Write a protein that binds this DNA or RNA. Structure first.
Lengths: 56, 114, 123, 125, 52, 209
RNA sequence: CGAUGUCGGCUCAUCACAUCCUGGGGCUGAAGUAGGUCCCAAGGGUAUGGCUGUUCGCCAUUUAAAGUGGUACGCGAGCUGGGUUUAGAACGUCGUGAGACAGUUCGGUCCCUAUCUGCCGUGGGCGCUGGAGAACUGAGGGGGGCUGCUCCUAGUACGAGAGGACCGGAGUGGACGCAUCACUGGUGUUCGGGUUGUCAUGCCAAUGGCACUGCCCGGUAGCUAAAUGCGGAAGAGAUAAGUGCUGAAAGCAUCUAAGCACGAAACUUGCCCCGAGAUGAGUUCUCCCUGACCCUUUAAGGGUCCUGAAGGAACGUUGAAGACGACGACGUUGAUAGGCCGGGUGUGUAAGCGCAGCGAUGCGUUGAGCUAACCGGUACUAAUGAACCGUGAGGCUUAACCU
RNA sequence: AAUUCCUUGUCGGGUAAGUUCCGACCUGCACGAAUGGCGUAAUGAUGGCCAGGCUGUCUCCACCCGAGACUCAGUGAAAU
RNA sequence: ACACAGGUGGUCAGGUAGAGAAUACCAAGGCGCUUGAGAGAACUCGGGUGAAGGAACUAGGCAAAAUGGUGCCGUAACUUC
RNA sequence: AGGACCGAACCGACUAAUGUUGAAAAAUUAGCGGAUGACUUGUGGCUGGGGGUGAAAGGCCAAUCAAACCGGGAGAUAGCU
């Protein structure tokens, strides 16, 4: 099964209307270190909701 | 639920004997022989017991006029009048479905004796 | 659940020994006979002399099944083999004058009252 | 349909699953804290916490029953003589799952799964 | 396939390509095979009457 | 007539004295507080609107809250209209209970079927499979032809095909009531009603015989 | 002719009516039962096997009935490949021969990841004129619509007898559909047990790995049919053929011209489902926002400041919801999942120690030990303060009341 | 009949029902004696038919275990 | 044509079971096959189990199921013995 | 003893399913036939195109065969597209 006419560059864009990424809406800031991070994730320097949970 | 647990155990008979598989068991049963209402016995070996509170049941194999009959009973039915253990069997399993193939000397069960 | 091509033993004394079902009667597309149901049959084995011969086509009534019957309280009777009583094709009375093995209350009607006399045991 | 069904298949077969969680349990009891994919960690809870609960009671039968589910005597030692004592009071819920981010190689969601009581002198020694 | 509804005697033809040949051929055999059950009534109502 | 909104607790059975086992669904119909009443004047049709159970004060929204306050009544796990016969009359705030099915002989239970997800034509529509062997080539449970060619050259609307099955409103009609139990807030109907345990159920009297 | 792949079978259908059954009628060489024939009627229904590649047909046994046609003699980018239609070989036959036969016979590669239309499902955007959260109405659309046998009516009507009803009521079947898991069952490589070979944990004992889950035996929850609940309706409207009543034109007659009544599974409703994108974008309830300032080409105009509501989304724990989205529950003022406790269920009397036995083994401790998805509890673990989107009373014209 | 058009010849056997099979008949369209005739134990991934066993082949499908399908990340074709 | 499930002569021959160079589990030794991570729909692929029935399937028992070892007893027509 | 029997290696290729822009321009998985011989296999050699070789299928002769491949006559000829 295969096309009988070339699809336009119109239809190609129309299809890709939905291909776009949602950006991460906003970042939690930690109370201790003041670092920014993903909600519910530890920080780049090992903090989560106050306490240092990693030795790094 | 505790809603269903309470509707069931206002129906459960209090007075059922302990019996376990291998036990030979006579089970009496209201039949309507007409418009009259007789008891009819049914002796044989208990091959299988389901335990589910009210839904609890048990299967009984006998050899009746040269012909094998199982009969499942629903324990807590009023059709079952009474249950009554003749002989106590000594078997390792919970289900004696291997008795279906066997007849006679093979399908003997040891008595438990204790 | 007797159906076309099922082989049954014969409960009566009529002459036959094995028979094969060949219709389930009483409907279009009807799949199964259970107990107390009429089926058309043919005779396969038959003992050397007796009322009926091999190849005879006639009716029977199913009186025991392995699948089992059910009773109103949830109880099941299963048997260990499928079985039937041979009948005349037209009157639909029994041919056999004795009946071997136990049978059931599901027969208990106007029609098969002759059998539940002759049975050794009704369960 | 999987209406009301526990377990995660994890794109493996039952004998591979079984053995993974044997190794992964053992790794956690040795080190008290591992990095692993989120969904594996969540299924490591349902294996580890039953061993810790087993070792609250010492016996011999229990030791052997633990050794049937670990196959490592260094582990059952540490379960019975170091974590049965530590979590004597605690009624379940011995393991914490923290989410890091995402494994560079294949963009998988990662997560630490530590034990709850961690004074920090039993990974090296 | 012609068939006589009174008796039960049938015929065919299908040697030909043309349906109309096959029909008028099978009409011939149907004439013959109804003439043949004039002989088997005629001959069996001699030897009915001639036996007694 | 109106009916009530309950909850499929689950199934069990009732042995009668004469022998029989009746299989029953159990339906908890804790009592249905009327909120709103509708009337030929304002709404253009006659109907009540009822609620049941409890929401938690915080998990209610401000536009819900005000609707329930207006009536008088504590908030419940949703809302549900019922139309009204000639002569029937309910004021607001007027807890209807399962005593309404005291005299009633049959009912018409209605809620959401279980959720099978994406279902194939065999499961969904009872399409009979094809041969498992004698040469079949990647076509054991697929649905065969879907038309003709060229006339009419298109597949007709409402062709039975695969796709979502269940999770849909469903009625069952003319279920015998076995027991009503005012004190435990119950209702035991013979047989089987749609939905999972926990699902909500609109129970009405039988529209038919 | 720079290809429109063939009979039959499978799967899935769909329309016509010249109706096979069920429904309504008229005539009968219609006593009754049972038939014959014609008119209306397309709602639903409308076999299984033996033989053959077969369609067709014959035969067996059912059925209320096994209707006739159209759709590329419906359906191979859906299946099959028996038949026919390549190359091998053989028989009969024709030909001097190569070879040939709408003669027969054995054997013989069936590709395609779906762009557009269409169909089944499921979302995003915008719109519906301030924004939000609920519940509805119902324009329109879809599903469903089958029927047997037994009993009463009654051995009454009918008939010389043989036999034997309509009309109406009651019960129990077949087939088809929807739901469900309480029962009977199936499954249950996540629960328990037995057992072969072998390797390991130092060895004994006890365990584990591998051998299709090694082979087996039971089996929880879920899913499920063979399991068990329910369904087809009554009724109403307007009609078909048909039957009539009054009744002229045509002093009578006439169902018809005016007028009036009946009249069927068809039609419109009644039952079930979808349904305001019904752009003709409907209704009802509740909730939220009640600030300054400046400029230009002065208008449903542009900008700066303070303000950020209702609610929403996002994130997390998740679900009898699920391809993904979506839908539902919960997020510490918390039972949303995991663990934990207790129960339940399943397996069937663990290990260890003791006793008996030369030993395998047996007994005692012991209905022991273990026990998934279940029921009931329990904040032990994880569901974080926040941030993010969404504003600031909502156009003009005309009328009707209220000032 | 690997040969018979008419032909599903006729008769018998086997099946509830057998255009195939087996035994016969002879009306051999158009068998026939080394382009061999008629027979034949054994042999055959050879053609036809029947029976026991066994079965999800089917009545009529149900559930389960794995690999893809689907979602995310990286790479990235083709006929037309 | 590829870092291709194909093809390629000769030699060596450990343990336990076993007739065996078959098959299972292992030693010596060597590998985890150069995309992963989730999910647990239809449908397809490769497997397992199945109530009652048992070839009714079909062109045809195609496919699947079943049979299966050693020793001992016992074994028909027909036969070129 | 045997163109004897069962059955691995080795030689083959009957059935099915998969694959059919493949893992593969003929394979894979599960079964299947021969397996002391008219067997099988390595190395080297001979036979050449109207010629070879053929337990014969018009089979094979470098993925090509009712007349190989490479170059030449050669811009063959084409009342056809």
């Amino acid at each position: 099964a295969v096309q009988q006419n070339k699809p336009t560059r119109s239809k190609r864009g129309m299809r890709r209307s939905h291909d776009a990424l949602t950006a991460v809406t906003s970042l939690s800031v930690d109370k201790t270190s003041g670092e920014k991070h993903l909600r519910h994730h530890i920080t780049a320097d090992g903090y989560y909701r106050g306490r240092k949970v990693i030795a790094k | 639920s505790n809603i269903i647990k309470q509707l069931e155990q206002e129906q459960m008979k209090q007075d059922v004997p302990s019996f376990r598989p291998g036990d030979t068991v006579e089970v009496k049963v209201w039949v309507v022989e007409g418009s009259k209402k007789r008891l009819q016995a049914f002796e044989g070996v208990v091959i299988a017991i389901r335990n589910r509170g009210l839904h609890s049941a048990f299967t009984v194999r006998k050899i009746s006029n040269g012909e094998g009959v199982e009969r499942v009973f629903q324990t807590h039915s009023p059709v079952v009048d009474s249950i009554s253990v003749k002989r106590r069997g000594a078997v390792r399993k919970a289900k004696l479905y291997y008795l279906r193939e066997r007849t006679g000397k093979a399908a003997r069960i040891k008595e438990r004796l204790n | 659940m007797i159906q076309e091509q099922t082989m049954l033993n014969v409960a009566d004394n009529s002459g036959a020994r094995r028979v094969m079902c060949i219709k389930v009667l009483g409907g279009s597309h009807r799949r199964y006979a259970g107990v107390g149901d009429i089926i058309k049959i043919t005779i396969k084995e038959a003992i050397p002399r007796g009322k009926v011969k091999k190849g005879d086509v006639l009716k029977a009534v199913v009186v025991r099944t392995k699948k089992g019957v059910r009773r109103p309280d949830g109880s099941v009777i299963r048997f260990d083999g499928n079985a039937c009583v041979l009948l005349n094709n037209n009157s639909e009375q029994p041919i056999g004058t004795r009946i071997f093995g136990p049978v059931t209350r599901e027969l208990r009607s106007e029609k098969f009252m002759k059998i539940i006399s002759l049975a050794p045991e009704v369960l | 349909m999987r209406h009301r069904k526990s377990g995660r298949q994890l794109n493996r077969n039952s004998s591979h699953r079984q053995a993974m969680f044997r190794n992964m349990a053992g790794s956690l009891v040795r080190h008290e804290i591992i990095k692993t994919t989120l969904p594996k960690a969540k299924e490591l809870r349902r294996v580890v916490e039953p061993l810790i609960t087993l070792a609250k009671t010492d016996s011999v039968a229990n030791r052997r029953l633990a050794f049937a589910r670990t196959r490592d005597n260094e582990i059952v030692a540490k379960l019975f003589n170091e974590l049965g004592p530590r979590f004597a009071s605690r009624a379940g819920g011995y393991t914490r799952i923290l989410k890091c981010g995402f494994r560079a190689g294949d963009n998988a969601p990662m997560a630490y799964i530590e034990l709850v009581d961690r004074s920090e002198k039993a990974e090296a020694a | 396939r012609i068939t006589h509804i009174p008796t039960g005697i049938v015929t065919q033809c299908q040697n030909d390509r043309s349906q109309h040949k096959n029909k008028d051929q099978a009409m011939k055999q149907m004439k013959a095979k109804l003439y043949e059950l004039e002989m088997q009534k005629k001959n069996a109502e001699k030897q009915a009457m001639e036996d007694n | 007539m109106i009916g009530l909104v309950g909850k499929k607790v689950g199934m069990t059975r009732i042995f009668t004295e004469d022998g029989v086992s009746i299989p029953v669904t159990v339906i908890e119909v804790e009592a249905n507080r009327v909120t709103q009443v509708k009337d030929l004047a304002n709404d253009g049709y006659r109907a009540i609107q009822v609620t049941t159970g409890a929401k938690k004060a915080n998990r209610v929204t401000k536009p819900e809250a005000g609707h329930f306050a207006k009536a008088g009544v504590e908030a419940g796990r949703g809302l549900w209209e019922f139309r009204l016969a000639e002569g029937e009359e309910f004021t607001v705030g007027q807890s209807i209970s399962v005593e309404l099915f005291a005299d009633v002989k049959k009912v018409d239970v209605t809620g959401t079927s279980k959720g099978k997800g994406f279902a194939g034509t065999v499961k969904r529509w009872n399409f009979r499979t094809q041969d498992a062997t004698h040469g079949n080539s990647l076509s054991h449970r697929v649905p065969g032809s879907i038309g003709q060619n060229q006339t009419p050259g298109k597949v007709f609307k409402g062709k039975k095909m695969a796709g979502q099955m269940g999770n849909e409103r469903v009625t069952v009609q003319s279920l015998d009531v076995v027991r009503v139990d005012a004190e435990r807030n119950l209702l035991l109907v013979k047989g089987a009603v749609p939905g999972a345990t926990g699902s909500d159920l609109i129970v009405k009297p039988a529209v038919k015989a």
